[PDB]
Amino acid sequence: VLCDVFGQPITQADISNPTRARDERPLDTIRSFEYAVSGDPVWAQQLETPTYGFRVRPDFPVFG
């Protein structure tokens, strides 16, 4: 019954914010905030959550 901006649905809800997806990375939130002001289809086509997920990108350097 719940849905996000751009109409895409939601299945796993966040623990602290029940109205947001669990695996959404911060850049997607920034783009959604920008889209909320002015209607632009260009903001919706730059999402990257499903292809990468919440894990870090490959070839991320190592610290120590």
Partner: protein, 1406 residues
């Protein structure tokens, strides 16, 4: 363009991309278990900071500056904590701070290694370091108030991260682990000490303040390496015994109830006063002692007599004046003894006092010895030049000791001599002794002002002291009023009266000695401030037109940043677009009519065929007036030049809200009427509004417009919100004015230009916290949604609650953020941007601080402005925002590498940043806050405490002269006062003392001196009445007998009264001048008016009036008129200005309202305060008995007589009567309520009336028994009455003092009741005594017109008729007027009879 963060993402020189910054946050959240929705918020915060700092410098410098400010720099708090705790370098830091002037395994090597390590970091490691700290800070809840605990947690987490345990672990740590394991136990410890659980609810349990561990007590544990060692686990092992990589994982097993403890305890206020300000009494009392001792040879001259003029040996004179050093050495010892009760005995730093005590007593012994040698009879009987040499040396030694103890601060007297390995300082130097020094002329001015003040004061006081007291001392100390005395004690009761009078005179002058320095300080400050004007070139003689004519050039050169632009356009076309904007802005607020507009606007009318004729200046240059005048005046002072709006930083406005009104309802408009009251206050605006209404037009829109109009003139949140939204339009106006190429390149597309301007305005300007948004009434939510519809860019924060996950467990509490662009759910609520879970209820203590704390995580930018619920702002003042932000001295400075190897600490120029900027029409209420500096050292709140904390930590405070803010005591026993008093240098200490506490001390000293003078006057008048007098003038020879044989000289005693009266009159005039200055530029029922001044110079006033009357009747002196007039004016001033008090109807309505209103070691310390009452009562009793002693007349021998038993009956009879009445009330069915319910529901009033009646009757009996002896003498009763009252007060005070430290508790209740009844009885008499004096003033019929004349001197001078009421109200009014006139006249008749009856009795009775 069209990017989230243009300053960083659109630059090709950025060292790290945004996609490489997001992954660091993601990895940290995975590894440490932070909440995700807080991680998003902190990512946004960090990116906004990077965008803000990159708009005026390179990204490479921005990242390095952020790292230096947050972790590794000299301005960072983390480095200070590290060096103070881990490396144990506090003593070296204090020593370096002590000797900075001479400078400008060791501290230098440690700093070198730290800089070398910090100099070779990659940018990614810097980003990780900053991100970890921000993530830790975002979750801290109430731990944000304690910076050092957070630093310790951050260090533990950083140590755990780099270990192989974290790197080789496979699965991520479960979400929410940090908050559950680390923060919740500390929150529970904080909460469980204030509240206790009963019946399932939390109730604020009560205990003395010394058994509650506040926030400051937790913080101070993490300042020392010894405090860290006290952390213990459950199994019994210490935390520090584990290796460095495992302390984080076991941080959830610490039991905090066995660790924290109290570090500072309070006591009686006089101990704090003595300890904090020891440097002042040393420089006062020591000088007074020398002045008095040098001019009183009688007390140490062998067989002294002025007639034989035998001067004492000079050796005695020099030895006596050398005792000044001993007094100073004793004061320091006494001050050190008191300090031993403030700090724990085993806490670090407490061992300095024991070392200091031995040095102080050694100095005392050194100062004491040689004087004892000189005074010895061996060198008194035989003269020796060696004794004279010893006295001459000791004089200079004493002077040097006085100076040394008057200059050096108490904390740090003998640090360099100890050289011990133990703590050499009582308090931490890093966190409590980091004052910022002064540089330049301002440093020299501070020395010069105080040197001038003290040089003037010490030279002026001696001239008056040498002569006002030389003769009275000589006359009084040698006279002998011999008598036979009273043989129950002896003749000692009469021979010591002159010496008692002399002692009282000396005591009064000692107090008078303290009032001159404030006077001289005021005078010198005024003179220097006036003189500085000629260097500043301030001109007041110039005409206002000479200011108005220069306005456009000042606007062009100080408001616009036109220096950076190429000069393509003329100044006038730029000035016009701003002047017209301001003028039109004032018009739309209904402040100007249509005809007034064209007198001020720039016009386009003239011919366009020639380009020069295009524009013409207004005739003005060839509430609106107040604002224009202030703007024109403020543009005259020098202003820093601004930056272009594409280079300015970001700032936020923060507002708290609790139960305030958002909008006025229709009932508030049409009911009582507010609308008529507003219309008769603001007419012209009302005609303007109604005229404007029909231009565009149940009348919904008209009703809404009326609601808005009424709201804008009343105290509402909408007024404040609409006031401060002028920041956005000012920024848009400046942006479009300062570069016309962007305007031109759109070519008529207005919508695109508006969108582009709004996009720019959103970046630079940003918040209201409503803690009750989930609890509003429906009409409150209806108003709240209106604000979001009117201003889409407004943000709101509120608290939200959920039912517990597991059954029977505390509910969860969250914090949410919404704004005007959020989607509306089908429930009617808006979708939150963020939700962050808290560990519990955040509001523990009352105040706005806990409201601001939970909403502080949502701010953005670099600077914060703190406002309140009701404040106002204007468009003209918002245009100068860019110049105000330049006061922090960070916008146009050179960028350097903080980690360069060659740089030394003394060569750095950015050691002390600016923390607070406060507006004025060096403490003050803060307006603008440096966010980075303040949020890393605690919260933002309490204002004066925030100022003290910022000063102590090492920041600076400045004031802005060209900005105006639309704004519209004895608890200071704190740590801050102690730290400031015991560690500041002398000049700063004097400047601080003479501003805040010196005013209150002066107000106390004046009141004390008045009572001392009254006691001296009573005793002197008694002696003068008893003695035989002689009169003489200054034309006297050296010594000759007076015409009356055998009289006693007392004329200098009379002269002293005149001199003291003149001095006190001058002091009162100087203290009253500011009230006149404040008041003379602007031209209530009796119960509350009386209650306001009750206990404030009214009871003491009457007590002084009684003694003044006695001193007047017994003996007459001319200067007593001034005191009579002053006291009468003080008593009767408040009733003069009461509106329409002359009217009979108002008078008796007030009378009715008044009448119906009537209807361990602590043991001796808590009771040592009774002595001053005992001394005063003893003085009054001696004065009373002296007249009874019959000293003036030749006394009969061996006849005994006494009157003390009369006095004890006088004092004890009313208390016994009251106790008997209470016993009778107990006997009359106190075990059955209904009898009292049926007879008198408030039966205590009957007992109160009986007590008042018997109290009057006992005084009547006093008068009768006294006038049995005296049929024509009156002076003799008043001193006895005063003695009786003072003994009553002493008994009550001693009873209360013993009470402060079955019928056991009923005994306490009865002890309270007995003083309560006497207090009520006194108040009853005092009220009528006040009222009867005003009777003749209301009798004359002409008082009405004369009082109404004063209405013309008053500014408003507006009166409207009272609302209409029915005739029955008039009938009741006249009936009550009749009743209360009769009652008033009957009471006055009783009072008059009470006096006239004994007058007849004195004749008819024996």
């Amino acid at each position: 363009p069209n990017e989230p963060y243009p300053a960083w993402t659109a630059d090709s020189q950025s060292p790290v991309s945004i996609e490489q910054i997001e992954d660091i946050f993601i990895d940290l959240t995975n590894r440490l278990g932070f909440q995700r929705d807080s991680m998003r918020n902190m990512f946004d915060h960090f990116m906004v900071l990077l965008d803000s700092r990159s708009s005026r410098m390179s990204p490479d410098q921005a990242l390095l500056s952020l790292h230096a400010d947050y972790i590794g720099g000299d301005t960072a708090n983390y480095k200070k904590w590290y060096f103070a705790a881990q490396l144990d370098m506090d003593d070296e830091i204090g020593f370096r701070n002590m000797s900075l002037g001479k400078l400008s395994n060791s501290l230098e090597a440690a700093d070198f290694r730290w800089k070398a390590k910090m100099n070779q970091l990659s940018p990614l490691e810097r980003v990780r370091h900053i991100a970890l700290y921000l993530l830790c800070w975002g979750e801290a809840n109430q731990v944000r108030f304690t910076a050092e605990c957070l630093c310790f947690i951050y260090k533990c987490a950083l140590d755990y991260l780099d270990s192989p345990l974290c790197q080789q672990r496979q699965e991520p740590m479960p979400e929410g682990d940090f908050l559950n394991r680390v923060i919740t136990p500390i929150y529970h410890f904080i909460r469980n000490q204030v509240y206790e659980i009963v019946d399932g609810r939390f109730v604020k349990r009560e205990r003395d303040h010394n058994k509650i561990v506040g926030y400051d007590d937790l913080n101070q544990l993490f300042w020392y390496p010894e405090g860290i060692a006290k952390i213990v686990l459950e199994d019994g092992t210490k935390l520090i015994e584990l290796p460095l990589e495992e302390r984080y994982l076991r941080l959830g097993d610490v039991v905090w109830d066995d660790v924290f403890f109290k570090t500072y305890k309070e006591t009686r206020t006089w101990l704090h006063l003595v300890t904090n300000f020891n440097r002042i009494w040393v420089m006062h009392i020591s000088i007074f002692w020398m002045y008095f001792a040098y001019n009183s040879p009688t007390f140490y001259t062998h067989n002294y007599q002025q007639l034989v003029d035998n001067q004492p040996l000079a050796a005695y004179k020099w030895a006596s004046c050398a005792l000044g050093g001993t007094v100073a050495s004793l004061i320091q010892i006494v001050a050190t003894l008191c300090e031993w009760s403030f700090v724990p005995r085993k806490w670090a730093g407490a061992q300095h006092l024991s070392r200091r005590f031995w040095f102080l007593c050694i100095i005392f012994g050194i100062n004491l010895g040689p004087i004892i040698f000189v005074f010895a009879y061996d060198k008194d009987t035989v003269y020796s030049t060696a004794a004279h040499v010893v006295a001459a040396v000791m004089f200079f030694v004493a002077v040097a000791t006085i100076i040394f103890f008057s200059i050096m601060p108490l904390g740090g007297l003998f640090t360099s001599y100890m050289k011990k390995s133990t703590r050499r300082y009582v308090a931490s130097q890093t966190f409590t002794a980091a004052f910022a020094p002064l540089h330049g002329l301002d440093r020299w001015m501070s020395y010069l002002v105080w040197v001038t003040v003290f040089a003037a004061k010490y030279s002026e006081s001696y001239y008056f002291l040498v002569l006002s007291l030389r003769d009275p001392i000589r006359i009084l100390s040698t006279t002998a009023m011999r008598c036979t005395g009273e043989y129950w004690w002896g003749a000692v009761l009469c021979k010591v009266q002159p010496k008692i009078v002399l002692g009282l005179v000396i005591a009064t002058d000692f107090i008078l000695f303290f009032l001159d320095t404030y006077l001289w300080y005021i005078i010198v400050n005024t003179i220097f401030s006036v003189g500085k004007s000629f260097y500043l070139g301030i001109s007041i003689l110039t005409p206002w037109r000479n200011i108005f004519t220069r306005l456009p050039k000042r606007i062009y050169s100080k408001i616009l940043a036109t220096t950076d632009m190429e000069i393509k356009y003329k100044p006038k076309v730029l000035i016009s677009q701003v002047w017209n904007a301001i003028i039109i802005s004032m018009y739309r607020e209904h402040l100007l009519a249509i005809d007034h507009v064209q007198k001020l606007l720039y016009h386009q009318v003239p011919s366009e065929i020639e380009g020069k004729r295009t524009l013409r200046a207004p005739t003005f240059f060839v509430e609106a007036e107040r604002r224009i005048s202030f703007f024109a005046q403020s543009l005259s002072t020098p202003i820093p030049e601004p930056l272009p709006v594409d280079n300015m930083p970001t700032f936020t406005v923060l507002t708290p809200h609790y139960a305030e009104r958002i909008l006025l309802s229709l009932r508030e408009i049409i009911r009582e009427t507010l609308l008529e009251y507003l219309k008769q206050l603001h007419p012209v605006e009302w005609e303007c509004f109604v005229k404007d209404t029909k231009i565009l037009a149940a009348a919904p829109e008209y009703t809404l417009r009326t609601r808005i109009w009424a709201s804008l003139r009343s105290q509402t949140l909408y007024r404040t919100i609409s006031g401060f939204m002028n920041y956005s339009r000012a920024i848009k106006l400046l942006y479009r004015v300062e570069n016309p190429e962007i305007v031109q390149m759109f070519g008529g597309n207005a919508e695109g230009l508006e969108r582009e301007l709004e996009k720019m305005a959103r970046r630079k300007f940003k918040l209201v916290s409503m803690q009750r948004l989930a609890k509003f009434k429906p009409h409150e939510l209806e108003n709240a949604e209106f604000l979001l519809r009117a201003y889409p860019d407004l943000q709101i924060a509120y608290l939200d609650e959920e039912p517990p996950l597991t059954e029977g467990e505390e509910p969860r509490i969250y914090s949410a953020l919404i704004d005007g662009h959020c989607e509306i759910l089908d429930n009617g609520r808006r979708r939150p941007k963020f939700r962050v879970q808290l560990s519990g209820n955040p509001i523990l203590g009352d105040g706005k601080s806990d409201n601001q704390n939970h909403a502080l995580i949502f701010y953005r930018g670099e600077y914060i402005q703190l406002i309140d619920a009701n404040q106002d702002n204007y468009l003209e003042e918002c245009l100068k925002i860019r110049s105000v932000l330049a006061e922090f001295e960070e916008l146009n400075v050179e960028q350097v590498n903080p980690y360069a190897p060659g740089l030394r600490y003394e060569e750095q120029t950015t050691n002390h940043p600016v923390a607070i900027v406060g507006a004025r029409e060096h403490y003050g209420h803060p307006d603008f806050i440096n966010a980075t500096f303040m949020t890393t050292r605690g919260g933002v709140s309490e204002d004066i405490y925030a100022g003290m904390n910022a000063m102590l930590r090492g920041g600076r405070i400045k004031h802005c002269e060209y900005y105006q803010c639309g704004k519209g005591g004895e608890q200071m026993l704190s740590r801050e006062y102690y730290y400031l008093g015991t560690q500041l240098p002398v000049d700063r200490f004097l400047t601080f003392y003479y501003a805040h506490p010196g005013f209150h001390l002066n107000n106390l000293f004046i009141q004390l001196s008045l009572q001392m003078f009254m006691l001296t006057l009573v005793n002197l008048s008694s002696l003068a009445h008893e003695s035989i007098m002689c009169i003489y003038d200054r034309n006297k020879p050296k010594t000759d007998v007076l015409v009356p044989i055998g009289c006693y000289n007392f004329q200098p005693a009379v002269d002293w009264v005149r001199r003291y009266t003149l001095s006190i009159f001058i002091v009162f005039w100087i203290a009253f001048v500011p009230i006149v200055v404040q008041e003379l530029i602007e031209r209530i029922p009796f119960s509350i008016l009386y209650s306001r001044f009750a206990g404030s110079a009214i009871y003491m006033g009457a007590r002084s009036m009684l003694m003044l009357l006695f001193g007047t009747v017994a003996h007459w002196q001319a200067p007593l008129l001034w005191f009579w007039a002053s006291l009468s004016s003080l008593i009767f001033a408040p009733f003069v200005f009461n509106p329409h008090q002359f009217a009979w109807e108002d008078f008796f309505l007030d009378y009715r309202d008044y009448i119906r209103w009537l209807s361990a070691h602590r043991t001796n310390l808590i009771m040592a305060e009774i002595i001053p009452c005992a001394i005063y009562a003893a003085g009054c009793f001696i004065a009373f008995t002296f007249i009874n002693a019959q000293t003036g007349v030749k006394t009969t021998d061996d006849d005994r007589v006494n009157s003390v038993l009369r006095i004890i009956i006088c004092t004890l009879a009313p208390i016994a009567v009251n106790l008997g009445v209470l016993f009778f009330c107990m006997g009359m069915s106190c075990c059955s309520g209904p009898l009292f319910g049926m007879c008198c529901k408030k039966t205590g009033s009957v007992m109160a009336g009986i007590a008042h009646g018997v109290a009057v009757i006992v005084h009547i009996a006093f008068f009768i028994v006294m006038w049995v002896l005296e049929s024509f003498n009156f002076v003799r009763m008043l001193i006895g009455v005063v003695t009786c009252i003072q003994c009553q007060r002493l008994i009550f005070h001693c009873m209360t003092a013993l009470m402060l430290t079955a019928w056991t508790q009923p005994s306490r209740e009865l002890t309270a009741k007995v003083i309560e009844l006497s207090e009520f009885a006194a108040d009853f008499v005092l009220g009528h005594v006040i009222l009867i004096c005003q009777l003749p003033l209301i009798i004359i019929p002409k008082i009405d017109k004369f009082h109404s004349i004063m209405l013309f001197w008053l500014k408003p001078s507006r009166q409207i008729r009272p609302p209409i009421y029915s005739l029955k109200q008039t009938r009741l009014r006249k009936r009550m007027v009749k009743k209360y006139c009769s009652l008033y006249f009957l009471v006055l008749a009783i009072f008059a009879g009470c006096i006239i009856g004994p007058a007849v009795a004195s004749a008819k009775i024996h």
